């Protein structure tokens, strides 16, 4: 039988659902009355979904068995319908390294699709705020749309502002920087951070890491660290457990630093 | 001059501070009037710290320069004065994979020092709750002490309860399991999860992964995945950028699954 | 001008050549008079190759520039026209770990395409020998053909023999085992090895590693080790040096052991 | 009983042996009459070794059980009594990528302890030759001593010569370069290689990789590749198989290229 369960997860018109099938295909869709999805596994009648609930079965016209799920933020970030993102394996780590916590004031720039922005927004809680600087109007509006859909827009002030003139905010708890040329903005980042505030940026190349580190070392920053991660999945076969054949080899070099007031008395 | 800055970061008696020095030694201490720290860099008079602020310099008796910092949760987890933990590189990822978010109800068991518990507590927000089952009284009390110090105890209900009889809660959003023998508890975990709820566990060995996967595959779980990560730091020398000589080779295999109501109609 | 250079590299009818183009496509072909290759870059007239030499340019009918090269053993193993192999990243390491050297007597079983066999054959020198047991006639003949083409057949005695009855040779220097069920052959391997002789095998799964280790530990073997390697290539762009986007995540777990005469006096 | 076995492995005065104990300590020593080794496991009387053979047991004065082994080249390279080396995980791979084979003429510079030199010497066979340029007399003599002990000196011509004036040899099959500043020698390397000859170098830092790649790209070289490898060992416990806690994070970036005669007709 249909369980009432968690009421906030009740499926209604306009909700996002994730339909997951035996061959591991997944479809992220907006629920709307009288919509049909045409897939390689057959037709899915979304009207049926309104009479079901998360964790329940849905069958295609061809009898293929799928399950109705509530998408996670990761699901949304990955099924991003497509631009460049900070991937979840990195964003989660970066948010913890930045110690983002309830009530924090955080600067994020640029914003892009809002994927990293969303992670930071979850972490600041209802009482914190992300000041998200994005001079590219098209991305400001994409992020606004995504963050709204993801239930996080109330926690993010999107500012269509060029950061060359500096940030408006002072004494922010942490700052994440993701721009093509981070070395050109490190001074402004330093100025915005509280004493003991935390800085992170991502660089795609080793050349960029080198240049960014040089700039950090010119300013009052300590505890400078550079990290990369490799995540490897395994075939979930109890009798034949082994890594998958191919993996992602690289997303980004992550650089962290802590602001101090001065180098010397 | 001393900047007022972020008022909640004001240093007072009983606060935790992190003192960070040029040779990269770091000391996590409770601030108390008239306490001195004796270190290989000299004596630090903590009375001085009350007249300073985060990001400011403190000198030892031997003239060595350090900085006063507010410890992060990572700092607290790592400077754990020592038992087995889920490391931050894993806990951050696991919390994001579990989609832990504002208002979520989460089961955590066992608890240990509370390191993973803390990550989950930050993620559920002020409106969520972590039900933390820990039958070992000594660890229940350690976790209570740590979570209190870390400003998170209001979000965690520590239950000194054996999980062999099942969990009290139903329809929880996600569940994290960390026990020596996770295969013996998967049924109870399934029962506690909402439809579409998310499960994670950690296993130190490949044998344990194999056994846990077998048990998951007997129950109504889909989207089963197994992950490991390797994190590599670099020497932050702009002119000689290269990985450090030695790294951590292994913490844990991470296993995830999503609860569904049934395998077949 | 055409340089005489290394005379043994002179191109003649029946030689293998590797033609390498700007878009990184490579074509491994047998040189024969009046043959043409039809490719996505145009037609290559192999008659032209006989009037050129290694390191020289060859143009397709469409004006695309390629270079004539002598294929390496790696090139031959990879451009294997297709069955399961031990990959070069592993075979090179395994041969060094086995200390394969001039004059050594080495057992190899099974053989397959002869890829690992070839590596061992190079390592034993002109005075050593590889005893290659391959009960599958089709693979015995493939390996014979490959090893002949690769100039190594004089160093390999291919024996179409079932290893269930043991090896004919005693006191061999090293032994490489690659079969679906290595645990069923470890006793026979031990019997064939000299005192202090070296054993290696490869296993695709962690389950197989576990079973193989159990069997090794029942016999007089010491210095038991298990290795895996990850090889990551980089984009060779001086101004934008970074890892390629995707890599191989897994070939094989490698297990090594050294034979001793007995566990106790 | 004592088995005659492989006669070339007979232990005699002046031979190197490796004594391997239960706690995994290993001692590489020169066998000499009336020598005793004093270790944390007790005294080993080397006179006893002359009455034993590889794979046989030797007991210390304190009753601890060890085994007599013939050291491998890896053992010799690692138990290097200490300077900078190319590690076996890299040297084996590099020698295969360079396609070093019977009869090849190979340039190696610098030489150092001769560790990489030895790998190349094994690979060229009795009919090939390594021209090893080492202007540092102390390292020329160390390498000569090591290569002699390792049975490879007949295959290596050590030249105490500065490479700034170029190499004497032309049309060599492959060349390995290991110097602090490889970009300053790439022209001379190109000049020495045959058409289709293979080049490799190692760089400790990403900066050095960038500079070396720039220089390669100025000259007639194709198939330029950059590789790194991570090797991870496992605890060989069948019931608790998992990676060791800590591993080597970095040895060297490996760069390869193939010489062609010219960039354009
Ligand atoms: Cl993003
Ligand atoms: Cl924990
Ligand atoms: Cl093979
Ligand atoms: Cl070396």
PDB file of C-alpha atoms and ligand atoms in Angstrom, chain B residues 84-86 111-117 178, ligand 2:
ATOM      1  CA  UNK B  84      38.831   5.726  15.382  1.00  0.00           C
ATOM      2  CA  UNK B  85      36.984   8.263  13.210  1.00  0.00           C
ATOM      3  CA  UNK B  86      35.405   8.728   9.840  1.00  0.00           C
ATOM      4  CA  UNK B 111      28.736   7.330  17.157  1.00  0.00           C
ATOM      5  CA  UNK B 112      32.208   7.020  18.657  1.00  0.00           C
ATOM      6  CA  UNK B 113      33.806  10.422  19.170  1.00  0.00           C
ATOM      7  CA  UNK B 114      30.934  12.082  17.293  1.00  0.00           C
ATOM      8  CA  UNK B 115      33.078  13.208  14.342  1.00  0.00           C
ATOM      9  CA  UNK B 116      30.698  11.973  11.611  1.00  0.00           C
ATOM     10  CA  UNK B 117      27.761  12.826  13.910  1.00  0.00           C
ATOM     11  CA  UNK B 178      29.363   2.427  11.120  1.00  0.00           C
TER      12      UNK B 178
HETATM   13 CL1  LIG E   2      33.276   9.259  13.550  1.00  0.00          CL
END
